[PDB]
UniProtKB/Swiss-Prot annotation, chains A, B:
Induction: Induced in the presence of gamma-resorcylate. The gene is graC. The keyword Zinc does not apply. CDD domains: MAR. Changing residue 242 to A: Retains 25% of wild-type specific activity. This is Maleylacetate reductase. Belongs to the iron-containing alcohol dehydrogenase family. Gene3D superfamilies: 3.40.50.1970, Dehydroquinate synthase-like - alpha domain. It is an enzyme of class 1 (oxidoreductase).
Length: 350, 350
């Protein structure tokens, strides 16, 4: 056996269809009483309805969360948190909403109750990416990890199919990289395999019937495990490239994951195919090409060209990706990253 | 899916052969500097050798750890801890030594760094048993769960084969009951299966070659996961029966588990075969009868009669077993418990 470290941090994860009826009780369980409910504009009404349900337990709604968690928006949200007299945040939504809550927590020590409605998995990680002056940078710390998460699959029925598929691939990216992360361990790897298995089973079902509560519950269960293993063992080249392009080119985030994943996994698989073998098994092929084929079954975008990236962007992106790199089992110098980005731009099978 | 709550607390688990060289580093990482090193009288030499190596970071050695964690010993240990200006404990050795550290932690808030040398699994539970002027008590709480565990298989090579087998079966019992816990969750269940797989692989290897570090590492990995699930979810018939029956008759603890497990698992398996299916699949298609066959493979005692129990004792045991009502997936009824005890007394196939 390879040596390892396995670490747990304090968290309370509530999982079940209809579990979101318990938001009030979870606020009270923390000894708190004035939540700022957070959303993007895409779930503004849902946030307002939740705030109304909370009554005296809601201090207000901030519905302006933004992709890539830009510092300008965080500054507004913190001012709103302070002015409202809030004592916690309730983050209703996807990864952008969770990210805002984390950015507020970093600045204010606000406890977070997160109600995820996508497969981003941010709700169970101590990691925060924030964008400032065209660069997204990541931080990790106990201040960032949400105290409480409420998983209610009924809240995912309305997630549009397209973003359901690419958010699903975003979840899979977490688990795939967990298999070869610097801080990998056998339990995180077991959980990563189960998360991948769940996503591979569920996403085609969700595509076939977006209102299928069984397929939605399986996908959300998978996303929980995929996010958990990201939080536990960290990340590598794939996440670095997503953060680089996402931040700097303002690319659609889940879509960037979906497009890059077959290429970044194919690259790493050349060096550690044994570590990626369990993923290769689940996709019924090689890990990289198998992901490309699976993403095609889901109808996900397959090229960076489809995301509006220009060939002229790639040099700068390859250079930026070598600043503050994430650990990788293969060397990831600028020449190699540029070639990988060229492959992803073209969108052909790895 | 069955809804669940998954709660974690802070813990760092360091796993690897030779890892015990890293105790100083773990004390430093906690920001602590005055460790009271704990042991039994036998491991006094080992404890003093560790304290010497710790230099500035050791406050002293207390080497009077005793079975069942008697309050008289704890009082002397706490007096030593407080007089030395200690700020944590290092619990080197068996379950008794882990218990002493927990008893000190209860009273002093001492962080615990546990270096287990057995399969007790106490190092990853929030449970503490104590004896006070003869009175055995059990408590549980977050203050009891050790902050740090260092698993070094090289420290387990001296565990005699007999107790290795029966304590290994006792560890498996935690995982088997975790699969049907009232508060079962997917992470505890995955851990449970993995712990069972590890013990099923390792224990026969240990029996063949007790000095084999590969088999020993796998067994210690199994013990960690089985202890973790003991710590995470509620046990049931098997544990309640071993506790009451072993406690009342002062029967050898691990041996009682080893004898009863096939029968108690068989009993529950009649009602919830699907929950035990992941275990049944590891032991030939039926969990209860499979565990009977597996235990025989290890040379474990196979009957209550082999543990000194007489036919005339069974009535009283059945009364004790049904004296204190608790949750089980199958009704616990005296008639069925009588039949279970008779089968266990005879050492017959379940």
């Amino acid at each position: 056996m390879q040596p390892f470290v396995y670490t747990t941090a304090p968290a309370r994860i509530v999982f079940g269809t209809g579990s979101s009826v318990g938001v009030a009780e979870e606020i009270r369980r923390l000894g708190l009483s004035r939540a700022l409910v957070l959303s993007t504009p895409h779930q503004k009404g849902d946030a307002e309805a939740l705030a109304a349900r909370l009554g005296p337990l809601a201090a207000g709604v901030f519905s302006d969360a933004a992709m890539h968690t830009p510092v300008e928006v965080t500054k507004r949200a913190v001012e709103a948190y302070r002015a409202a007299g809030a004592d916690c945040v309730v983050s209703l939504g996807g990864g952008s909403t969770t990210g805002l809550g984390k950015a507020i927590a970093l600045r204010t020590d606000a406890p977070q109750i997160v109600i995820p409605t996508t497969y981003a998995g941010s709700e169970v990680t101590p990691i925060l990416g924030q964008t400032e002056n065209g660069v997204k940078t990541t931080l990790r710390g106990p201040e960032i990890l949400p105290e409480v998460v409420i998983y209610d699959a009924e809240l995912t029925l309305g997630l549009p199919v397209g973003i359901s598929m690419t958010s699903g691939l975003n979840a899979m990216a977490h688990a795939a990289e967990a298999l070869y992360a610097r801080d990998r361990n056998p339990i995180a790897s077991m959980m990563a395999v189960e998360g991948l298995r769940a996503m591979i089973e569920a996403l085609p079902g969700v595509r076939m019937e977006p209102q299928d509560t069984k397929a939605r519950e399986t996908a959300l269960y998978g996303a929980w495990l995929c996010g958990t293993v990201l939080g536990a063992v960290g990340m590598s080249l794939h996440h670095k490239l997503c953060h680089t392009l996402g931040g700097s080119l303002d690319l659609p985030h889940a879509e960037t994951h979906a497009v890059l994943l077959p290429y970044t996994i194919a690259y790493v698989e050349q060096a550690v195919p044994d570590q990626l073998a369990p993923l290769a098994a689940l996709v019924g092929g090689r890990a990289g090409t198998g992901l490309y084929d699976f993403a095609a079954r889901l109808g996900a975008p397959a090229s960076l060209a489809a995301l509006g990236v220009g060939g002229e962007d790639l040099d700068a992106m390859a250079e930026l990706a070598t600043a503050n790199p994430y650990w990788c089992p293969r060397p990831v110098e600028k020449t190699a990253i540029r070639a990988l980005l060229q492959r992803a731009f073209e969108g052909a099978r790895p």
